[PDB]
Design a protein around this ligand. Structure first.
Ligand SMILES: Nc1nc2ccc(Sc3cccc(Cl)c3Cl)nc2[nH]1
Length: 477
């Protein structure tokens, strides 16, 4: 559901809501007003409201006095199923419809009809503020293969209704009810609420116009996408096994069982297959996971590794050195690696590595390691040029290699900068194959990658970087 997230609420409003409408164990999560980019977990315990900081600079959701999580929905689920104790028992539900995909706010019946004509199909819908009745709403549906129907939504004592029957405490409750139990028109027409009207899918050539519309917008679009993360709470059982605990960099940032990379000749690595050319999104190696990392690269026939972290950042180990020094030969378990040559560029270093299995002459292949070294400690690069140029080179290397396996992409936890690189690369690959005249949907593409690994793309800063990267790529064409 993800109803416990309140997007437009202050700390005082949150305390008031938990005191007057909540009980002990009641909680909500919201964006931090005193430091944008951060979040606050507001909890009621023994008659009083406490506020707990969640930070995210781009790698994970770091909860004060708690753990590091891939998403807020994953954090909430962990504490619900599990300096004294704070109990998360009861979500305080938000009635605000702003982050709902179908909510459009200020829109006319003429304009809603135009948008439903252009992008709509049978069962496409939206909810907008009423023109004639200020404070009321309008549900606009498309039916057929075709027509558009407008259903008036009355707001009477902050409860919503369609003229009769049930009175709902929020537009969400009304939308959910009439989605399960569709309204039938007198003459037979079933007003099916199949899917919300798409607004994010744009033609590639027109990216500059949307970036301008969102630069006035980016925050609202991202948060609508974040609201959809509750649909991606897939099982991560293999990652929770006792034998696999110390193979994870962050205890609760785990690979989905259905997409994890299974090792066949144990079977565990914290990595997932990303299918849009495919990728392996993984974490930075631990001392005890270097061998399994090389077994993964060898088994998957990967010929290209993208590393988007320094070994050490802010005096903390982000990835152990899994490759030999230049000209040196090392043995990592059954795997053998030679670092043939290192090439230094402005933003990155290329390492030409020869990988083979010990005792097997013929299994040798070149593995090209692209190590981006200039990504800032916090946030995203100011300009996308460097990232795009690095990515163009990586794409060309992979393209030149006959039957190359997935491209391996890693940072620290392997969800933020990793998620960001993979998404930019997916969107650009669409534009190089189709041209300026093609459709691109940034939130749709992210949602698709997020169903394959938790919290792929962590922040609004990264979200805006993906848009700026795409815009830059289209501009230099
Ligand atoms: N109005 C409006 N703004 C939005 C911002 C983000 C999203 S998320 C999304 C977008 C496309 C496809 C899929 Cl599958 C998803 Cl989940 N939907 C929105 N609708």
């Amino acid at each position: 559901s993800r109803r416990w997230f309140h997007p437009n609420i202050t700390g005082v409003e949150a305390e008031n809501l938990l005191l007057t409408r909540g009980v002990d164990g009641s909680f909500l999560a919201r964006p931090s007003k005193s430091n944008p980019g951060d979040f606050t977990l507001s909890v009621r315990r023994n008659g009083a409201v406490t506020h707990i900081k969640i930070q995210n600079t781009g790698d994970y959701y770091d909860l004060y006095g708690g753990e590091k999580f891939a998403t807020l929905a994953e954090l909430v689920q962990y504490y619900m199923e599990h300096g004294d104790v704070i109990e998360l028992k009861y979500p305080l539900n938000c009635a605000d419809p702003t982050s709902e995909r179908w909510f459009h706010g200020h829109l006319s019946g003429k304009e809603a009809e135009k948008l439903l004509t252009e992008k709509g199909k049978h069962g496409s819908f939206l909810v907008r503020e009423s023109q004639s009745h200020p404070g009321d709403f309008v549900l606009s549906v498309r039916t057929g293969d075709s027509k558009v129907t407008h259903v008036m939504i009355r707001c009477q004592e902050l409860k919503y209704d369609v003229g009769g029957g049930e009175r709902f405490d929020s537009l969400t409750d009304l939308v959910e009810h009439y989605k399960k139990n569709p309204m039938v028109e007198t003459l037979g027409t079933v007003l099916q609420l199949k899917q919300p009207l798409n607004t994010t899918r744009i033609n590639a050539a027109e990216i500059e116009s949307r970036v301008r519309e969102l630069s006035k917008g980016f925050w609202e679009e991202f948060e609508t996408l974040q609201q959809q993360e509750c649909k991606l709470l897939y099982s991560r059982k293999e990652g929770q096994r006792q034998e696999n605990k110390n193979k994870n960099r962050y205890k609760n940032i785990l690979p989905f069982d259905h997409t994890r990379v299974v090792l066949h000749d144990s079977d565990y690595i914290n990595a997932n297959i990303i299918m849009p050319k495919s990728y392996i999104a993984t974490q930075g190696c631990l001392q005890n996971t270097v061998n399994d990392f090389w077994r993964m690269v060898f088994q998957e026939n990967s010929r290209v590794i993208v590393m988007t972290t320094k070994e050490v950042e802010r005096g903390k180990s982000k990835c152990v050195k899994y490759w030999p020094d230049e000209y040196a030969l090392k043995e990592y378990g059954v795997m053998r690696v030679r670092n043939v040559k290192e090439s230094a560029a402005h933003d990155y270093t290329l390492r030409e590595l020869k990988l083979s299995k010990v005792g097997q002459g013929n299994t040798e292949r070149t593995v090209w390691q692209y190590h981006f070294r200039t990504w800032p400690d916090h946030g995203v690069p100011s300009d996308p040029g460097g990232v795009l140029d690095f990515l163009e080179e990586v794409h060309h290397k992979q393209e030149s290699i006959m039957d190359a396996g997935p491209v391996v992409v890693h940072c620290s936890a392997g969800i933020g900068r990793t998620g960001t690189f993979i998404v930019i690369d997916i969107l650009i690959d669409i534009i190089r194959e189709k041209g300026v005249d093609c459709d691109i949907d940034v939130p749709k593409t992210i949602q698709m990658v997020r169903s394959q690994r938790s919290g792929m793309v962590q922040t609004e800063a990264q979200y805006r970087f993906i848009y700026m990267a795409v815009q830059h790529y289209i501009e230099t064409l």
